[PDB]
Design a protein around this nucleic acid. Structure first.
Ligand SMILES: Nc1ncnc2c1ncn2[C@@H]1O[C@H](COP(=O)(O)OP(=O)(O)NP(=O)(O)O)[C@@H](O)[C@H]1O
Ligand SMILES: [Mg+2]
Lengths: 88, 1177, 628
DNA sequence: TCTAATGCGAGCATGCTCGCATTAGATTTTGTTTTTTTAGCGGTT
């Protein structure tokens, strides 16, 4: 159910991505994102934390890439919690 | 014990390193120890996951992993305190030691997002991917025909036959495939037109392809010149003919006249068809020599044929005509290029949709990921490439002489920097490259050998290893003797000079035995004679034990079958050989890639599957019937037909079942089979093909049956991998009987095949029949090389078109309307060039084959006539040079055409050549000599088996076997009994949400009631409004959904508290609610036949209420049952019935509290919301 | 599952099973595939074969047989796409001949009726689904379209029937899983409309998501029994009071396990994320180390006995290596002997071979192979002579005997009895030269062919014989037209050759192989190719006629049966008469000094002529028969 | 599909090569490559 929600959100905000645009097309991708965000929740990391980590990144060899990823993930994450807030 | 050069290779750093050396130089060993040394270093330590080792085979990778782990352990024994080495032993499972394909797979998996690839992609089965390709080729062709463009028809007409267009299909496939061996396939495809961009004004000699024409001409004219010179020499001999000299000298002059014009194609067009040899001057007298007389004429006629061949090749049309034809073909090529490009784009789109990739997509997608910017072949490294550059300190490549351009690109992007100061270590041997059929480029190696210097200053360093540590001197000398005469320049692509010759370095105690043997063999198959000879000599090796020396251990061991290895160039002959060796009694193992569906067991088992799929297939049905599965004989079969002639065979079978009587045997066979058939058909609908196949096996016992007939081991293996193959295909894309069968049929129709299953594992003591290609990098004590008299496969030359890595697409000039075709110049050039390349590689194949051996080498080849071939061998061997005549080597069609003449100048069949320290044992066998029944001992047991009666008497294990076969598990009955049980169970399809009336589910109401009943304060009896304030305390805290809240009778809830039992509850010393419990109950109570040793069942439940008054402990339950609505006596009709409805449950609950708390409960009450009734139990 | 089934060992697997084999799941998937790919053969018949389209309360066996013959029909006539939903009835002919045009027999009518009747219950639910689906724009109305599709085909009722049928057979678990399949599907749809119900999406995205959902579906865990072997894993499984433990597949690369790093966040991503103070799940690096603890817990789990096994080879025979753990164990227990696990009992001790006889089937299976080995002059264990003997003592030794009759198995055929032969082939044998040739090639082939009349499954595909028939018939039509216009082959012009040839192929095309030359554009071009061939052949015959003194008398002449010439006949010992009837391609007459001359001409599609060797062995008899 | 054998006649040095044409035979592939993590039900309907 969350995966489907993700796919929806992905279609809606794919234009805002910095690195996962090419992959947002793929079905495997939404599964990956779902697993990632679930891990985030299991390790007590709210959307704002993820945003913050991204911002920290923008300014380690793969820091640029990682920050891009975390940015896209944070858009999907935050949007998810928005969509789920008072109903699910 | 490392050689100086070896150590140089093991320690050298700072720059790209190429290690070039012949066979058995320790290149692979050097590589391993370089790795070890790098990791296990006191001075500077690096982790194993900081190196990239790319091997050729997965086995080689695993082998490296172990040969490493052991060294790590020795280092650990010597240094226990080491934290590092300890960690390295662990990192070995995280190590990048594999094939390049595996590395590509890791790249795609991690950086999928950089390209258009699904992270959950999978690599397609060979046939699967090919089928996808076949489909899109069909779609594409239909679209082109639909469009009906004139260009398309102009192409089809030229490259298809007169009734179908399959050849064009194959053509597209082949061209696409070839193009995929370049880093930029499209660009290579678009370079096609340039070969055809000529005019009548163009200068032939300046055109690229003409290079290969030039050489050919230069080779044949000289080839004739020499051929005449010999004839001239034959004039000087005493018995030789003197008067014919003036003939030869004339011909020579004429041929020499052509040689002065080799460079000018036009002049050659003028002179070559104008050359005529004056009539042979007859020499009459007995002073001459009839043999020599008739031999010189052969040489002269040889010159004639060479010239005529040159003429028909190049000079039957003017250069202007040739160029006009070539230019004419240009538009057709342009259409072909565009067609192949559409195919690819479509093929990729197809594979993308199913989220799969080629085996070929691995390389190309990896390369895509590694590049960011590509400028005319200049690839700038992407982020992924930088990552892999930093992660890997060094990149190690073995078998580099078989690297291809795509792989090389990937290596160039993962390695760190320019050649001069890079981290690319590579070992290999040009002489051993055997994968040009797979478009590998050994020239990649060669160019790097030429650019590199021993000094390695400003460039990369090359390192030579001269010593051979693998084999005995007999092998090395035999090899070196053969290849100084064969491999050179045009044929071999490499000089077999002193630096490249094998040099003894291994210590081996002597043997008279190790002589290299050549066995020439003169209504029986030739392969059978060869196999007979092989087996014979193998038995000779076994009868008196050959001694096998372990160079490292320095300890001998008796000869084992696992020491003998038979190498073949091609495996068509392998089956017959295996059969013959088994006839002689020798154990054989050969890894096969074909013949699976020819196995009768496979055919029959498949037939069962098809019949289960659709019984209305006469032949698969009849097949299953006549098979041992049913066992109907010919009379019984024809009997089935008789019931119904016009109908399908299945119908006839049905009818015989309908009319037949239970007394007959045939009816019983057919009735059993039909019952089985129906069982299986039902079975296929909710089970996989695999489960079906295993079930068919256990119902028919067909695997059991075939295991007891000849070849049984193999047969059971076949049926086994039928199961396993099914499991793989199910797992992947063909789940279910129908899809699986379809896949198998589609596969077979293509011309694809699977290999027969391996009955025995490799590690067992058997003689291995393998291809020479499988042999590389390996060493074996004794080695056979058979099929030497067999022709080279050069079918590629014969087609109307040819593909070339350098030149592209060569074709015949083809005019569909005029009905004429003839080779264009670049086609002939590409043909000649291809023959050269092919021959050179076959030589390298032979080199690998011979260098495999350690101590013994057998060469078996067959021939029509010994003396004729010996004569021809001599004819090619009269030269004083080591290297045989270039043209003669160019004319070779079989391996014997190489080995023969090179073996002719040897003593065993010029002192430098004749006296070479190579020993050859020549056997001139004829078929009849190879050609060379046992005691008839009856067996009581065999016939007793036939009868079905037992074997006479009293074996040791009779008693124990009796005991086991009649054994039954004591606790059998309780093996199926579920442990956890429901209180409801002990007594023992819904629409979606968006299709229903919203809300107010009947059970929901009851559950709601329950929740309030358990969260209501029990301090005192509440008011009717009080309970409601409780309810929006509950709604707010979301304990009950507002939907549930809306549906609640507040009066019904309050009413219970007015009643005397409820009054007791509020006025209770102690009270508790929603009390869950688990209770153990001996299985016997719920199930008869159970036992005390047999575990108790667990029964869980939730008790609504429990309260303790001064008198005792009481149980309370609530039911949202419907009472007042439908009972004749109302509650009093309900009361006996309700008591029944919950009696079992209550008895279980009371048993729980009674057992666990060990306190008897005085009374139990059932409160019903409907009517407020309370039933006492 | 299968092995422990055969060795009668009760087990509990710590894992859920897939629904991907269930008829409902495949029904939905294949149905959507029917829509997406426009009624391709494979999709449609996947769908049909799940049996959920079957007419309610009709006998599934009979329905199946009907579908089967429909399927053969579709394959033979190349039915796909629009042809399914066209109004036209599927037309059926048992055999179509180019030369002679025939009226539909009564059997053919009966068949045609059956085929179309089967079609008429297949198409509507699928057709209606397709219609509803094109019209549905949002996730919810597509989900509703699909669910309605399930409702209208009475899927819940059919599945419930299945539940009961299974329960009656005692298959409680297999019966329980049907309702699981239904509830799973309904939940899938429910969620889909819950998250994206109002969003408009394409059919491709819908099918994609539905498929992604169904791939993840799993049945519930089978509840544990009172006495089961526990089969599970090493990462998540928990046990208690275990007495014996078998650790399996202790292979290199397997144990310890190579972790797969691949997620959104790399190992180096995670490792760096740690240094900046954010903690996530263990990256692969750590897990690879925790493998030691896993193996430690696995090894110290039993109280009494521990087994550590590893296979050396693949299912395909690929070599598997023993892990480091095996060596490590060899170090800690250097005097322990390693035991061999093989399906070749000969390779172990008699005491171990005795372990093999666990029940009657296992025993039968191993005994038969041991018997084979024995016949190959090898000493099989006493265990197998004991076993064989008990098997022969037991109640139904006839079965074991049948199994062991493999020891003397040969591929033998029993000669046909006089009465059977008489009935099959008849008292009078009507034949063709080709039948005789078939027999001379191989008697059994002739038996399967002209005896049993076994037909191979027909395919919508242009083979060589069809093309041959086309050529023959074409030349016939041309010749006839030539005589009707008082024209002779000599007087033909190039223009006339082209015109006649094209016309002839045009005429014959709709009759050739189920109208396959009209089937596609590619086949249109095939037709053109054939036209070009016939054209050139026409011209060639015209040139040959201008240089030959031989004049064609009869073309496609018939001897025997209907044809004017009488059948050549033979008499037999049996008292049976064998008459052979056939058709000569061409016969030419000439006038000469020696007399009237006759020659026979045959139109063939191969360059090869007549081999006397093949004549001697009875492989090539047609020509000399025609001449005779 | 290319190499080899067979047949016949013209030009040359009555018997021999050579040209040419043609057919007929037989003779015939090699190959490798993965894993997908991530905590059993549910008493009461
Ligand atoms: N310095 C040495 N001392 C002793 N034995 C050696 C030495 N170098 C190599 N060998 C042995 O010689 C054999 C050949 O070594 P190998 O590593 O296969 O070389 P290679 O160049 O890779 N052979 P190849 O791949 O076919 O070209 C192996 O069995 C080694 O153990
Ligand atoms: Mg090597």
């Amino acid at each position: 159910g969350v995966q489907m929600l993700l796919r929806k959100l992905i279609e809606e905000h794919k234009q805002e991505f910095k690195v996962y645009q090419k992959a947002s097309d793929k079905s495997g991708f939404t599964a990956q994102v779902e697993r990632m965000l679930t891990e985030f929740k299991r390790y007590c990391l709210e959307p704002e934390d993820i945003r913050r980590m991204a911002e920290s990144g923008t300014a380690y060899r793969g820091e640029r890439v990682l920050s891009e990823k975390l940015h896209d993930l944070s858009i999907l994450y935050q949007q998810m919690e928005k969509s789920l807030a008072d109903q699910y | 014990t490392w050689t100086d050069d070896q150590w140089n290779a093991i320690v050298s750093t700072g720059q790209d390193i190429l290690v070039a050396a012949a066979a058995g130089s320790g290149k692979t060993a050097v590589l391993v120890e370089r790795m070890i040394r790098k990791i296990t270093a006191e001075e500077n330590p690096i982790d194993v996951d900081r190196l990239l080792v790319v091997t050729f085979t997965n086995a080689s990778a695993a082998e490296m992993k172990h040969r490493i782990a052991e060294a790590l352990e020795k280092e650990l024994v010597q240094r226990p305190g080491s934290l590092h080495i300890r960690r390295q032993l662990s990192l070995l499972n995280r190590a990048s030691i594999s094939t390049l394909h595996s590395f590509c797979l890791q790249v795609l998996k991690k950086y999928y997002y950089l390209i258009d690839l699904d992270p959950g992609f999978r690599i397609a089965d060979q046939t699967e991917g090919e089928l996808i390709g076949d489909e899109v080729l069909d779609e594409l062709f239909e679209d082109e025909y639909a469009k009906g463009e004139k260009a398309f028809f102009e192409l089809v007409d030229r490259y298809t036959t007169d009734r179908h267009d399959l050849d064009l299909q194959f053509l597209v496939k082949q061209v696409y495939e070839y193009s995929r061996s370049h880093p930029n396939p499209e660009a290579w495809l678009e370079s096609f037109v340039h070969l055809y961009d000529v005019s009548e004004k163009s200068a032939i000699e300046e055109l690229p392809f003409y290079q290969y024409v030039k050489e050919d001409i230069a080779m044949v004219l000289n080839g004739a010149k020499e051929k005449l010179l010999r004839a001239l020499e034959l004039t000087k001999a005493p018995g030789g003919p003197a008067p014919r000299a003036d003939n030869f000298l004339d011909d020579l002059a004429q041929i020499d006249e052509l040689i002065q014009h080799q460079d000018d194609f036009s002049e050659l067009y003028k002179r070559v068809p104008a050359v005529s040899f004056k009539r042979a001057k007859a020499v009459k007298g007995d002073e001459f020599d009839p043999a020599l007389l008739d031999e010189a004429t052969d040489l002269r006629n040889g010159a004639k044929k060479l010239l005529e061949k040159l003429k028909t090749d190049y000079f039957t049309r003017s250069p202007e005509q040739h160029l006009k034809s070539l230019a004419e073909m240009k538009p057709v090529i342009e259409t072909l290029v565009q067609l192949v490009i559409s195919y690819g784009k479509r093929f990729e789109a197809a594979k993308q949709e199913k989220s799969i990739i080629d085996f070929s997509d691995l390389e190309h997608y990896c390369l895509a990921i590694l590049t960011a910017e590509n400028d005319k072949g200049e690839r700038e490294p992407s982020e992924a490439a930088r990552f892999y550059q930093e992660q890997f300190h060094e990149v190690l490549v073995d078998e580099y002489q078989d690297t291809n351009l795509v792989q090389e690109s990937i290596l160039q992007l993962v390695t760190s920097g320019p050649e001069e100061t890079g981290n690319l270590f590579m070992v290999g041997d040009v002489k051993q490259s055997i994968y040009r059929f797979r478009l590998a480029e050994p020239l990649l190696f060669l160019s790097k050998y030429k650019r590199f210097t021993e000094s390695g200053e400003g460039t990369g360093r090359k390192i030579d290893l001269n010593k051979n540590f693998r084999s005995r001197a007999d092998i090395l000398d035999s090899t070196n003797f053969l290849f100084k005469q064969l491999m050179g320049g045009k044929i071999g692509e490499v000089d077999y000079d002193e630096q490249a010759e094998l040099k003894l370095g291994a210590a081996y105690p002597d043997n008279d035995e190790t002589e290299t043997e050549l066995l020439l063999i003169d209504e029986l198959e030739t392969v059978q004679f060869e196999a007979k000879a092989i087996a014979k000599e193998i038995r000779k090796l076994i009868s008196s034990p050959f001694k096998v020396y372990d160079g490292k251990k320095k300890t001998h061991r008796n000869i084992q079958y696992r020491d003998i290895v038979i190498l073949l160039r091609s495996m068509p002959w392998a089956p017959q050989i295996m059969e013959e060796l088994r006839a002689q009694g020798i154990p054989v193992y050969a890894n096969l890639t074909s013949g699976y569906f020819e196995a009768v067991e496979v055919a029959v088992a498949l037939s069962v599957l098809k019949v289960i799929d659709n019984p209305y297939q006469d032949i698969p049905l009849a097949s299953v019937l006549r098979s041992p599965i049913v066992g109907a004989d010919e009379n019984e079969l024809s009997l089935i037909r008789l019931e119904n002639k016009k109908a399908p065979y299945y119908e006839a079978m049905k009818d015989y079942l309908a009319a037949g009587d239970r007394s007959d045997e045939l009816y019983q066979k057919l009735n059993t089979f039909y019952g089985h058939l129906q069982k299986w058909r039902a079975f296929s609908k909710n089970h996989s093909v695999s489960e079906l196949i295993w079930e068919v096996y256990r119902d028919t016992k067909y695997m059991d049956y075939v295991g007891g007939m000849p070849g049984g081991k193999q047969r059971q293996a076949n049926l086994r991998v039928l199961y396993d193959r099914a499991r793989q295909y199910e797992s992947t894309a063909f789940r279910g009987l129908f899809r699986f069968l379809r896949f198998i049929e589609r596969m077979q129709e293509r011309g694809d095949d699977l290999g027969t299953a391996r009955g025995l594992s490799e590690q067992e003591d058997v003689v291995r029949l393998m291809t020479i290609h499988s042999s590389k990098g390996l060493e074996f004590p004794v080695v056979f090389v058979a099929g030497l008299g067999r022709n080279f496969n050069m079918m590629d030359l014969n087609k109307s078109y040819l593909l070339d890595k350098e030149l592209g697409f060569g074709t015949k000039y083809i005019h569909p309307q005029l009905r004429i075709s003839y080779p264009t110049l670049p086609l002939i050039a590409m043909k000649k060039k291809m023959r050269r390349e092919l021959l050179s590689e076959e030589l390298r194949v032979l080199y690998v084959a011979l260098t495999r051996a350690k101590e013994k080498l057998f060469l078996i080849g067959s021939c029509k006539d010994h003396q004729k071939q010996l004569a021809k061998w001599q004819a090619s061997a009269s030269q004083t040079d080591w290297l045989l005549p270039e043209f003669d080597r160019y004319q070779a069609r079989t391996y014997l055409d190489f080995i023969g003449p090179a073996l002719a100048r040897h003593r065993d069949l010029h002192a430098d050549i004749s006296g070479h320290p190579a020993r050859f044992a020549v056997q001139m066998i004829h078929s009849y000599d190879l050609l060379d029944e046992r005691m008839e001992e009856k067996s009581e047991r065999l016939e007793a088996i036939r009868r079905g009666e037992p074997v006479p008497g009293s074996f040791a294990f009779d008693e124990k076997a009796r005991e086991q076969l009649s054994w039954t598990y004591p606790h059998q009955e309780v093996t199926q009994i579920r442990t956890k049980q429901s209180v409801s169970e002990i007594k023992r399809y819904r629409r979606p949400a968006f299709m229903m009336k919203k809300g107010l589910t009947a059970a929901e109401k009851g559950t709601a009631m329950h929740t309030v009943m358990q969260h209501i304060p029990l301090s005192h009896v509440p008011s009717i409004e009080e309970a409601e304030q409780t309810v929006h305390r509950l709604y707010e805290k979301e304990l009950l959904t507002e939907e549930q809240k809306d549906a609640i009778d507040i009066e019904e809830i309050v009413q219970f508290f007015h009643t005397e039992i409820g009054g007791q509850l509020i006025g209770a010393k102690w009270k508790d609610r929603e009390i869950p419990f688990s209770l153990a109950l001996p299985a016997k109570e719920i199930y008869p036949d159970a036992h005390e040793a047999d575990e108790p069942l667990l029964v869980q439940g939730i008790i609504d209420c429990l309260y303790e008054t001064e008198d005792g402990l009481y149980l309370l339950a609530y039911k949202s049952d419907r009472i007042e609505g439908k009972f004749q006596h109302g509650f009093e009709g309900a009361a006996p019935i309700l008591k029944k409805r919950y009696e079992t449950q209550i008895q279980l609950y009371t048993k729980a509290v009674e057992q666990i708390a060990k306190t008897k409960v005085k009374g139990c009450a059932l409160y019903f919301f409907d009517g407020g009734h309370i039933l006492t139990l | 599952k299968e092995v422990f089934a055969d060795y009668e060992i009760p087990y509990f697997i710590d894992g859920k099973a897939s629904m991907l084999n269930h008829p409902l799941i495949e029904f939905i998937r294949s149905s959507l595939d029917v829509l997406k790919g426009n009624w391709r053969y494979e999709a449609v018949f996947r769908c049909v074969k799940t049996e959920l389209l079957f007419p309610l309360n009709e006998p599934k066996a009979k329905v199946r047989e009907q579908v089967d013959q429909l399927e053969n029909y579709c394959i033979a006539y190349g039915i796909k796409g629009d042809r399914w939903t066209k109004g036209d009835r599927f037309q059926y002919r048992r055999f179509v001949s180019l030369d002679d045009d025939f009226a539909q027999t009564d059997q053919e009518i009966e068949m045609e009726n059956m085929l179309n009747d089967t079609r008429d219950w297949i198409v509507p639910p699928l057709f209606q689904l397709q219609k509803r689906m094109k019209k549905a724009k949002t996730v919810q109305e597509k989900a509703e379209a699909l669910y309605r599709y399930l409702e209208e085909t009475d899927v819940p009722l059919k599945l419930d029937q299945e539940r009961q049928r299974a329960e009656d057979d005692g298959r409680i678990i297999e019966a329980q899983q049907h309702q699981q399949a239904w509830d799973a599907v309904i939940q899938l749809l429910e969620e889909f409309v819950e998250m994206m119900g109002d969003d408009e999406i394409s059919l491709d995205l819908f099918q994609q998501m539905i498929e992604a959902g169904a791939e993840s579906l799993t049945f519930s865990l089978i509840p544990p029994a009172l006495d089961q072997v526990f089969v599970g894993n090493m990462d998540l499984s928990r046990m208690y009071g275990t007495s014996c433990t078998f650790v399996l597949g202790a292979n290199d690369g397997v144990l310890p396990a190579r972790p797969d790093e691949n997620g959104v966040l790399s190992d180096d991503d995670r490792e760096w994320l740690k240094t900046i103070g954010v903690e996530l799940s263990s990256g692969g690096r750590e897990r690879l180390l925790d493998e030691h603890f896993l193996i430690y817990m696995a090894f110290s789990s039993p109280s009494d006995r521990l087994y550590v096994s590893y296979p050396i080879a693949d299912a395909e025979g690929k070599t598997l290596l023993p892990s480091m753990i095996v060596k490590r164990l060899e170090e800690l227990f250097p005097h322990h002997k390693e035991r061999l696990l093989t399906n070749e009992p000969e390779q172990v001790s008699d005491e171990e071979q005795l372990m093999y006889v666990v029940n009657k089937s296992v025993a039968q299976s191993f005994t038969a192979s041991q018997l084979r080995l024995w016949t190959r002059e090898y000493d099989i264990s006493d265990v197998w002579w004991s076993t064989y003997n008990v098997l022969m003592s037991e109640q139904d030794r006839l079965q074991s005997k049948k199994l062991f009759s493999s020891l003397f198995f040969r591929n033998e055929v029993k000669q046909l009895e006089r009465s059977v032969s008489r009935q099959l082939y008849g008292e009078r044998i009507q034949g063709s030269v080709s039948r005789m040739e078939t027999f001379n090639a191989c008697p059994f082939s002739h038996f399967a062919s002209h005896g049993l009349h076994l037909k191979e499954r027909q395919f919508f595909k242009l083979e060589a014989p069809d093309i041959g028939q086309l050529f023959h018939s074409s030349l016939k039509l041309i010749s006839d037209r030539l005589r009707d216009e008082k024209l002779d082959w000599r007087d033909l012009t190039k223009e006339q050759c082209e015109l006649f040839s094209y016309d002839a192929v045009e005429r014959l095309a709709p009759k050739l192989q189920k109208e396959i030359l009209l089937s596609s554009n590619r086949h249109y071009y095939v037709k053109e190719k054939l036209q070009k061939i016939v054209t050139r052949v026409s011209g060639i015959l015209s040139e040959h006629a201008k240089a030959s003194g031989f004049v064609p008398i009869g073309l496609e002449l018939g001897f025997g049966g209907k044809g004017p010439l009488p059948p050549l006949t033979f008499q037999l010992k049996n008292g049976c008469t064998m008459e052979l009837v056939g058709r000569i391609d061409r016969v030419d007459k000439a006038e000469s000094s020696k007399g009237l001359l006759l020659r026979i001409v045959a139109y063939k599609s191969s360059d090869k002529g007549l081999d006397l060797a093949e004549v001697y062995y009875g492989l090539a008899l047609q020509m000399l028969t025609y001449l005779d």
